[PDB]
Amino acid sequence: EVETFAFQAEIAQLMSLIINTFYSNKEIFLRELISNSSDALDKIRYESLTDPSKLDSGKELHINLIPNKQDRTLTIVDTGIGMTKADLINNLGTIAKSGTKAFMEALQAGADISMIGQFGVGFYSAYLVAEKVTVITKHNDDEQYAWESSAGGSFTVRTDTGEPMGRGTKVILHLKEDQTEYLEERRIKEIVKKHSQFIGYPITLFVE
Amino acid sequence: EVETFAFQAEIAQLMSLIINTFYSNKEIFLRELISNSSDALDKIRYESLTDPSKLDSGKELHINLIPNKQDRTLTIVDTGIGMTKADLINNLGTIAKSGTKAFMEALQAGADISMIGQFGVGFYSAYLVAEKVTVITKHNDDEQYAWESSAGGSFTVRTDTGEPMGRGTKVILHLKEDQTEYLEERRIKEIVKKHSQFIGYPITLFVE
Numbered sequence: 001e002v003e004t005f006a007f008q009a010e011i012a013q014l015m016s017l018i019i020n021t022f023y024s025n026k027e028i029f030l031r032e033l034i035s036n037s038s039d040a041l042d043k044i045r046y047e048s049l050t051d052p053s054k055l056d057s058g059k060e061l062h063i064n065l066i067p068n069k070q071d072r073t074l075t076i077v078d079t080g081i082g083m084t085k086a087d088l089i090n091n092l093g094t095i096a097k098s099g100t101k102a103f104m105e106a107l108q109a110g111a112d113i114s115m116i117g118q119f120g121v122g123f124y125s126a127y128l129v130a131e132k133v134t135v136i137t138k139h140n141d142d143e144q145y146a147w148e149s150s151a152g153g154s155f156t157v158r159t160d161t162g163e164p165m166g167r168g169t170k171v172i173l174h175l176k177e178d179q180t181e182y183l184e185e186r187r188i189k190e191i192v193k194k195h196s197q198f199i200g201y202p203i204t205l206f207v208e
Numbered sequence: 209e210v211e212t213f214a215f216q217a218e219i220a221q222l223m224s225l226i227i228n229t230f231y232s233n234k235e236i237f238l239r240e241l242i243s244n245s246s247d248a249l250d251k252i253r254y255e256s257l258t259d260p261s262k263l264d265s266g267k268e269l270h271i272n273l274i275p276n277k278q279d280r281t282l283t284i285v286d287t288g289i290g291m292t293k294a295d296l297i298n299n300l301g302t303i304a305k306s307g308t309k310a311f312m313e314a315l316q317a318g319a320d321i322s323m324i325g326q327f328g329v330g331f332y333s334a335y336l337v338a339e340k341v342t343v344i345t346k347h348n349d350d351e352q353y354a355w356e357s358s359a360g361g362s363f364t365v366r367t368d369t370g371e372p373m374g375r376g377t378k379v380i381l382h383l384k385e386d387q388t389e390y391l392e393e394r395r396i397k398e399i400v401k402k403h404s405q406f407i408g409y410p411i412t413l414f415v416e
């Protein structure tokens with residue numbers, strides 16, 4: 001059922017830095033995850049140009065933002081290419097080891113945490129606002145898997161028999177108690193407008 | 209020997225817009241091409257994490273900038289994943305049709321040409337400074353090919369028997385007569401520092 005893995009030392013250090021550093025501009029997490037969704041959406045679009053059957057699992061290319069105040073969750077859903085189990089394990093398809101090295105060298109030369117995505121590890125900025133993150137994903141060449149981590153040096157991977165998606169990625173942010181502003185419609189809309197206004201795919205903000 | 213192709217109507221319109229629009233901040237072309245090199249370098253690195261033999265064609269992951277005043281060329285070379293012939297034909301591995309649509313809609317809502325890379329078509333910004341662009345490329349799963357275009361609605365593709373590279377992409381910018389400042393060491397260095405200072409791979413500026 002549930003497999004447990006250790007984060008590579010560099011990734012664990014990245015996550016601790018993200019968790020323990022004083023850094024007020026937390027809102028950038030949303031731009032980073034929307035950007036990842038957009039990169040995955042680009043990939044399925046590109047593949048479908050030479051093979052339209054890659055879209056049998058879903059033709060609509062889009063991003064949904066789903067706040068749930070009762071569950072204290074902000075969920076980001078895309079219909080991008082999705083990840084294989086192998087991808088999930090290999091730091092969610094990132095070059096996380098080398099990217100972390102460059103990121104921390106940059107923080108040495110006056111970078112700040114908002115620049116995290118320039119190093120291919122924008123995903124981990126989720127830990128600015130979330131105590132636990134769940135990544136549900138479905139790639140055309142594999143089954144649906146759930147990745148999960150509350151940090152602390154380990155993550156899990158299981159097959160997901162919960163709600164089939166067809167194709168793409170769902171990121172569920174179980175928010176820290178003092179970060180509930182990211183569930184407020186007005187705040188989400190402000191953030192999307194500020195940082196994600198030219199994204200090439202529809203972004204739908206769900207109502208509660 | 210030489211195959212000739214028509215650009216898709218949207219790409220041809222993109223290139224004309226790039227060529228004919230008054231836009232002083234031309235220097236951004238270099239950041240866009242360095243960014244593409246960095247994305248291709250990420251890809252070969254990622255693949256090599258699960259298969260180290262992907263690096264038999266070259267272990268060093270880097271970017272070279274080669275100005276040649278006599279030839280009036282600025283050449284950008286990377287050891288990234290490279291492109292197949294199919295990739296070259298399909299708008300150099302870009303989602304150029306949809307990306308152009310989004311780019312032009314953005315230019316309607318107060319974007320400017322410097323934001324071109326947000327729409328996955330940063331390559332075409334080469335035409336800000338170049339009258340002709342040649343793309344030599346070698347992917348592990350194919351032979352070495354040369355793509356070439358002086359715009360005007362068409363491009364060529366040939367097999368390249370010229371100097372084998374091993375793996376990666378070489379972009380040769382045959383510069384417009386009034387854009388020779390991009391061959392000056394001081395100017396190249398200024399531009400790299402301004403826009404490409406946190407790139408995760410060595411950038412070597414060649415001396416003449």
Ligand SMILES: CCNC(=O)c1noc(-c2cc(Cl)c(O)cc2O)c1-c1ccc(OC)cc1
Pocket residue numbers: 033034035036037038039040041043078080081082083084087092093094120121123168169171
């Ligand atoms: C191997 C082919 N699959 C993908 O590239 C992919 N599919 O899905 C995602 C993805 C990842 C994350 Cl963390 C998201 O928040 C949203 C996504 O769509 C990705 C993805 C996007 C970006 C990325 O690094 C910048 C790595 C992975």
Ligand SMILES: CCNC(=O)c1noc(-c2cc(Cl)c(O)cc2O)c1-c1ccc(OC)cc1
Pocket residue numbers: 241242243244245246247248249251286288289290291292295300301302328329331376377379
């Ligand atoms: C299909 C797998 N190959 C690649 O992705 C690839 N290999 O090579 C390049 C590339 C392209 C360009 Cl236009 C460059 O200036 C530099 C490159 O390395 C690319 C490339 C980089 C970026 C891109 O779109 C943003 C498309 C293609």
Ligand SMILES: [Mg+2]
Pocket residue numbers: 094095096097098099253
């Ligand atoms: Mg790495």
Ligand SMILES: [Mg+2]
Pocket residue numbers: 071072073173174175
């Ligand atoms: Mg919660």
Ligand SMILES: [Mg+2]
Pocket residue numbers: 045302303304305306307
């Ligand atoms: Mg397209």
Ligand SMILES: [Mg+2]
Pocket residue numbers: 279280281381382383
């Ligand atoms: Mg020339």
